[PDB]
């Protein structure tokens, strides 16, 4: 089997992205954040706080006849950016473009963090990073790559995700027509439960590459590309009026400013990140300060690959016995 759905950024930043998920019998459509750095399929629901729930679209599992409360079990997961969720958990049918599995944990929130209730676009989360990260307890629970994973015609999912536009999560297939040139494969290590991979190296705009090794995850559901001080210094310094504010919390830049293209290693390859794809708008409405898109790692522990990098890239997830990521140009 595969599957293929369309994913569409939530703002005109590209602060995230949602992609359509059936839950059911019938069929309540939620628009999830597929992440590849979280292991937890959870959704607003009819057991939401009320006070907690602000436009999302919510599950009722007293609607499906395929839902099924897993007796005793209970979530609950902090998010790298301070936000959390709770609740408990039902099985049931759960549908990602065509591809469907029976039986997927289906974790109902029963309280959100005020970040999740005032975005009301984002309806749940569809976790992609290893089943060994999901917070089920008593018994742990799989994610929907790894129950459909047997039944794929290869055991793989794809993110395309665009630059203000919208693009797609493949499972089961690559689509050789969605990317430029070949794809390079570089190893994972699944020890913390993420795509933990190792570039091996970087150049700012038009400047020589660097070589060095850089261990960072990649992860749909982080916006931004955090990577050490050193590298994110030797960026921003490319940049004239650029500097690191303490009360913004990260580096800002003048929103005149055109910034240089980033380009990260993969292997012998190299995946370019155009200068737009680093400016995230205005610090406040009206400001002349703007967000950028670099940021350091240095007070996270781990350099992450979000989607500023990530939607540079065509992007293989390869869950074979020993996994892999590949990335090629688009």
């Not at 939401?48 to 609950?76: C, M």
């Not at 500097?243 to 980033?262: D, E, I, M, N, W």
């Given at each position: 089997?595969?599957?293929?759905?369309?994913?569409?950024?939530?703002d005109?930043?590209?602060?995230?992205?949602?992609?359509?998920?059936?839950?059911?019998?019938?069929?309540?459509?939620?628009?999830?954040?597929?992440?590849?750095?979280?292991?937890?399929?959870?959704?607003f629901?009819?057991?939401?706080?009320?006070?907690?729930?602000?436009?999302?679209?919510?599950?009722?599992?007293?609607?499906?006849?395929?839902?099924?409360?897993?007796?005793?079990?209970?979530?609950?997961?902090?998010?790298?950016?301070?936000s959390?969720?709770?609740?408990?958990?039902?099985?049931?049918?759960?549908?990602?473009?065509?591809l469907?599995?029976?039986?997927?944990?289906?974790?109902?929130?029963?309280?959100?963090?005020?970040?999740?209730?005032?975005?009301?676009?984002?309806?749940?989360?569809?976790?992609?990073?290893?089943?060994?990260?999901?917070?089920?307890?008593?018994?742990?629970?799989?994610?929907?790559?790894?129950?459909?994973?047997?039944?794929?015609?290869?055991?793989?999912?794809?993110?395309?995700?665009?630059?203000?536009?919208?693009?797609?999560?493949?499972?089961?297939?690559?689509?050789?027509?969605?990317?430029?040139?070949?794809?390079?494969?570089?190893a994972?290590?699944?020890?913390?439960?993420?795509?933990?991979?190792?570039?091996?190296?970087?150049?700012?705009?038009?400047?020589?590459?660097?070589?060095?090794?850089?261990?960072?995850?990649?992860?749909?559901?982080?916006?931004?590309?955090?990577?050490?001080?050193?590298?994110?210094?030797?960026?921003?310094?490319?940049?004239?009026?650029?500097?690191?504010?303490?009360?913004?919390?990260?580096?800002?830049?003048?929103?005149?400013?055109?910034?240089?293209?980033?380009?990260?290693?993969?292997?012998?390859?190299?995946?370019?990140?155009?200068?737009?794809?680093?400016d995230?708008?205005?610090?406040?409405?009206?400001?002349?300060?703007?967000?950028?898109?670099?940021?350091?790692?240095?007070?996270?522990?781990?350099?992450?690959?979000?989607?500023?990098?990530?939607?540079?890239?065509?992007?293989?997830?390869?869950?074979?016995?020993?996994?892999?990521?590949?990335?090629?140009?688009?």
């Amino acid at each position: 089997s595969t599957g293929s759905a369309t994913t569409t950024p939530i703002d005109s930043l590209d602060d995230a992205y949602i992609t359509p998920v059936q839950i059911g019998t019938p069929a309540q459509t939620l628009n999830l954040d597929f992440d590849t750095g979280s292991s937890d399929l959870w959704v607003f629901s009819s057991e939401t706080t009320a006070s907690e729930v602000d436009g999302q679209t919510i599950y009722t599992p007293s609607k499906s006849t395929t839902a099924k409360l897993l007796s005793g079990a209970t979530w609950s997961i902090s998010y790298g950016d301070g936000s959390s969720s709770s609740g408990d958990v039902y099985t049931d049918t759960v549908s990602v473009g065509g591809l469907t599995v029976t039986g997927q944990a289906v974790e109902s929130a029963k309280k959100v963090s005020s970040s999740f209730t005032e975005d009301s676009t984002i309806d749940g989360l569809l976790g992609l990073a290893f089943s060994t990260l999901n917070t089920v307890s008593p018994t742990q629970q799989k994610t929907f790559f790894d129950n459909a994973k047997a039944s794929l015609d290869s055991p793989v999912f794809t993110a395309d995700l665009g630059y203000h536009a919208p693009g797609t999560y493949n499972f089961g297939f690559i689509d050789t027509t969605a990317y430029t040139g070949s794809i390079t494969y570089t190893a994972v290590s699944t020890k913390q439960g993420f795509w933990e991979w190792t570039s091996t190296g970087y150049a700012v705009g038009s400047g020589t590459f660097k070589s060095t090794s850089i261990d960072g995850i990649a992860d749909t559901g982080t916006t931004l590309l955090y990577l050490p001080a050193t590298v994110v210094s030797a960026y921003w310094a490319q940049v004239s009026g650029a500097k690191s504010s303490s009360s913004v919390g990260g580096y800002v830049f003048p929103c005149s400013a055109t910034l240089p293209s980033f380009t990260f290693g993969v292997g012998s390859a190299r995946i370019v990140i155009p200068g737009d794809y680093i400016d995230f708008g205005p610090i406040s409405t009206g400001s002349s300060s703007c967000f950028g898109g670099i940021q350091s790692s240095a007070g996270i522990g781990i350099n992450i690959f979000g989607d500023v990098a990530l939607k540079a890239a065509f992007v293989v997830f390869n869950g074979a016995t020993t996994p892999t990521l590949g990335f090629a140009s688009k």
